[model samples]
Target chain A: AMAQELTAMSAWVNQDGSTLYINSINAQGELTGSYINRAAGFACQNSPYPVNGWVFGTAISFSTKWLNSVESCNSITSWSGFYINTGGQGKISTLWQLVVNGSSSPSQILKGQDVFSQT
Target chain B: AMAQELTAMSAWVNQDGSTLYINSINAQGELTGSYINRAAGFACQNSPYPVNGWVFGTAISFSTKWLNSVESCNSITSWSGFYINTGGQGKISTLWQLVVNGSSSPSQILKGQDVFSQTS
Candidate 1:
């Protein structure tokens, strides 16, 4: 069964609207490979799907909608949607994804784990 | 005299300053036809003026400024001004409006729905 969270911790939507992206973070403001699609409301995982080997450097974007999508599901999720071209090279690698949920109100939904690898 | 609220909840302005847009929302986060303009500070509604009914779909863009604009007015409002090519396609149907206003303190101004929707 799904976890049924209220909202995500962080999410990203391109100004062009061509891509709808989401990310998960930990209590320490880190990214883990956990995300979801608010438009579709589904989960993803595996390799690029789960964002296994992602790291953080300088700063990254975060939101509650992204976190809720990852927490709602109990499997691995991918960030290929909104992480296609960000940081480093045109590739979406070396990025962190954090997923935290299970809160009643829309307060402090940014809690999860940081993907530690180093760029 | 009008019922007059303190603020409009949401509003939108074009990058070239060509148009202004606004939207209203219920406590449930739903949108209404009410709206206003910040650049001009006026209500808009009815006959290509009111927003009528906007849906939530999957990824809807929202802002407290848009809400404040919608609430400040008493009638319906249209979104034809700033509702241009924001998302989806080149037609500009998926345009979004955002606004934010005053509170007990200055910090409360950024407390509407998603306060951190700013892009780098």
Candidate 2:
């Protein structure tokens, strides 16, 4: 069967690198919206960075044969695309934690999924 | 065996049928982002109808034996695609509600996927 390694969860990276936080102001402490880092700076070429949060939607699977061939996030940065979910209201924001250098921090990854904007 | 009829819950729709609403510094009641419906004007050409809330995600399976022809949602809407779910903090704002003119109210069917923007 042809199965894809789908992203179980995800989120947006602010300009500063702070993973956007979406907490609700409601009395119940529900998450309403999200905020990205403003210090990470704008996206650069081969940056594998997303200018828009929607860009990171899908997931990329590496062939078991090439599992050892995989280098670093920087190596597969070329295969990246934006992702979107346009169902109805109640749209949930998803996220996953990616470790960088021995640190269990939230790092961004690409999934090569195409995203269309209203604009 | 393949199937696709996903979607769970949520709300929106307020602008004469041709507008977009997003709870800004001036919160409305209990909504921080959402508003697309200004008199049913903007999108009608095939009108999968989606402005800013995020594009519909992936799903399209219709090759069964003698089941149902599925004639609603209006013509598969071109195999529609748009599904995302990153991994990080405590991010969770997903929903799935869609109904048009059947007497329900909140009628918008997409997915809580890929939402990246700092500009209203």
Candidate 3:
């Protein structure tokens, strides 16, 4: 059986009424993904961000850069965290902490473990 | 067959001739490790620090706190990074970026990828 990849996985918001759609591509042991944060009237809503990190056996950890908007290429800020799958169903959860000022400070810790299933 | 645990793996120094010995214990999907930097007259030498994070499959990412001394519990600063085992022999490498002033800035990026073999 071919192993399943985390690429094209979508996650639901557990606390806030938002959704994160993730599209990842793995190359040369590095995982790079594009994410869309869909939240009405939110700064991150309808905007695309870049995620970069490495995948360990069953766990995935990456850093994300949030762009100013969907039509902009400049990054406003960044955050880092990891995602772990429960292995029972096609569900995954993630926890992230913000890295402020180009890695000078850490703040705004957030976790969205709403059990994202494979889409 | 039981899978090998990265809980007790150790690594040799590649660039700075300093060795970092790590002993990790996994509990409730969280990993806590103790590290000793064996460098002569170094601030991190002979001192034990804490490593905390989660492990997914073959890759492990965690944050480390550096204590001022081996006899003290006060943390001087901290850094965060990940470890990836090459799955060849017993080699594992790591890259870390320092998180300064309680996560206010990032600096002092370091990479130590020398192969560390199992000691058991």
Candidate 4:
């Protein structure tokens, strides 16, 4: 039998009540997908960020960049990094981090992980 | 036929080289899982964090809390929030954010998203 391709929807959250949603596709070792952010205690709207990267074995990683158009920070350049493990049928999860390099100090904006199961 | 349960392995990454891997189990609307973190450019070691939360419809959300024991931070309190969409088979993805509030200034540590597929 042909091995199944590793693909499914997943989610993660932080302590401050913010959440992240993703829809990803991985085929023939290539990965492509997008995500949406719901900022906590902030009036930021739902923005979809593009993702592109690679997958090997049970390991996966990707990168993303976007602009921040909320709460007086219009000229912000945002960069993000993601990593996850998908090697089972019970749950899917990963680790994610984001950095706002411009319009704000080149500081680590967020760092956390998530777990999800297919429905 | 009965509807399939939402359960599988998944991963996510950011602009930096750091990565996160998670093994999750969701049954009866209860979400429980664990994750490992590999810091980028930093000598921080891989640490496992436990996750607990709930899932509704196609929407999933969870939270985690832990103590940091790497670098110059030993008494750090870290909190995380996660949300994702798992209503397909081609690709699965999500949005995640982390906050560190202790020892150092309370700051938004990281935020990003991920997408993945199943192999079985």
Candidate 5:
């Protein structure tokens, strides 16, 4: 069942306190979505922000901006990984690169992971 | 009078080749907008795409994504500069960093500038 790839406008729900609200995806697989961050940091708050992601083959790359109505966190985050599914259940096994804004040091971009599920 | 900082929802039009549509900006000067690229490239083709920028202390930084209905250009461009105005007319004088997508080499992110004026 390798044909269960999600190729439409929908939600990629994560079990670990995150839900990705995928809004529009074009013919070239460029998608725009929003999600609340469960990641730990002061630059990202509770509100949802905009994210642009791309899907190719089982690969997904979602870049999220940590800006919202509450605060302009201004941090940039991009999550890269693959989507795995079985029995109509989807899983996004992914890692992330978060570049902290307004820093004056050396290579402070943080690395992390967040796995999302499709149910 | 230099107090005319654009702090509300409006359009920043450029005469050279681009028009920036400022959608929603928050209290912390973070803004979201869309514009058609006038730069030299085939990655973007005459359509509006998503852009996110910030305004702090007369400084503005806008990042445009080359994604639209036609194609996912996948390139990222960030225009950074300031807003200058006289007689209620606002002018956005800026420079940018455009990192082209799907590149197989180093130092390919194009550098450029776009100036926008407030007339609407």
Candidate 6:
């Protein structure tokens, strides 16, 4: 059923309260936009950060650098996945990986998945 | 049957011999790449030109400015469509629009579509 591809653009959000504002897809296949993650708990909650990445085919991937936010998460979080339109609603399922910039003896990595949709 | 999303990068071409080398997708949702239009044409064939545009979801759109080629078509051409992988092959079907940038009494837009795969 995917042969009938559709074109669309807008803000996408998830149950975790993370929001992605896709501004424009520039000439270099780069995704220009802003993202706010509000997944609760964690000092980095509810802050807007600079986001970078690509939306390729059904596959979409992006990264948010926490250094420039209201408060730094001290980490670079990446989200990658695909965009789908089901029943006329835009949907994105992404897997995010964040490696916290910490002085811990062992390298700690944060990984999870988020499904976003245009409401 | 498209929920099974795939990640890929490479060259794509069609019977037209128009090659698209997707270099990288930048942070601004821009696709950095180069294109060579090898289709049968008047004066602008078999030359590499600078390309610009985006890859949005299953939908993709891009353009090539013909001024920097070996010879100028004097037009900016746009190609837009979707990228798909069917039966383990990368496929892209696109529609292109070009407006010759020279002396024409009435504006003329040259438009056509191309279906490209990994192997031309």
Best by TM-score: 5
For DockQ, the strongest prediction is 5
What does the lDDT read for residue B100 in candidate 2?
23
Residue-level lDDT of model 4, residues A52-81, one tens digit each, is 433333333444433333332221112222
Per-residue lDDT of B9-106 in model 3, one digit per residue for the tens?
54434344544445554442234455565544445565556544434333444444453334532222222323333353333344333322212112
Collision count for each candidate, in order = 56, 55, 14, 63, 0, 17
Worst 10 residues of 6 chain A by lDDT: A100-109
What value does the lDDT take at residue A50 in candidate 2?
Answer: 23
**Model 6 regions lying over 4 Å from their true place:** A1-119, B1-9, B103-107
lDDT by residue for model 3 (A10-76), tens = 4424334434445553442245455565544335566656554433333444444444334532222
Give lDDT for model 1: 0.25
Q: For each candidate in the order shown, give its overall lDDT on alpha carbons.
A: 0.25, 0.21, 0.39, 0.38, 0.62, 0.58
Give the docking tier of candidate 6. Answer: incorrect
Q: DockQ scores for all the models shown?
A: 0.02, 0.02, 0.04, 0.02, 0.06, 0.02
Q: What is the lDDT of residue A15 in candidate 3?
A: 38
lDDT of 4 at A104: 22
lDDT of 1 by residue, A1-119 (tens): 23212122323332222122324544332343332232222343221222111112221222222223223232211121112332332222112122222212323222222222111
Chain B only, TM-score of each candidate? 0.26, 0.22, 0.55, 0.49, 0.82, 0.82
* Sliding window of 10 residues with minimal summed lDDT for model 1 chain A: A74-83
Q: Which residue runs does candidate 4 get wrong by more than 4 Å?
A: A1-119, B1-5, B8-28, B39-47, B67-90, B103-109
- CA displacement after TM-score superposition, residue A81 of candidate 5 (Å): 19
Question: What DockQ does candidate 1 have relative to the true complex?
Answer: 0.02
What is the C-alpha lDDT profile of model 6 across B22-97, one tens digit per residue? 7777653456577888887645778787654554344455656565525765555555455566766667665554
**What does candidate 6's lDDT look like per residue over A1-119, in tens digits?**
23223123458888787888877775534566878878875566676776655543455556665644257655555554556666766677655545443322112445566878775
Candidate RMSDs in order: 17.8, 19.7, 16.0, 18.7, 7.7, 15.7
**Runs of candidate 3 exceeding 4 Å displacement:** A1-119, B1-28, B39-42, B68-88, B102-120
User: What fraction of the reference interface contacts is present in each model, in order?
Assistant: 0.00, 0.00, 0.00, 0.00, 0.00, 0.00
Give the alpha carbon lDDT tens digit for every residue of B1-115 in model 2.
2221122222322223222233321121111232332333223322223211222122100000101122222211101122222332111221212212112112132222222
| Lowest lDDT block of 10, candidate 3 chain A | A99-108
On DockQ, the stronger of 2 and 5 is: 5
DockQ of 3: 0.04
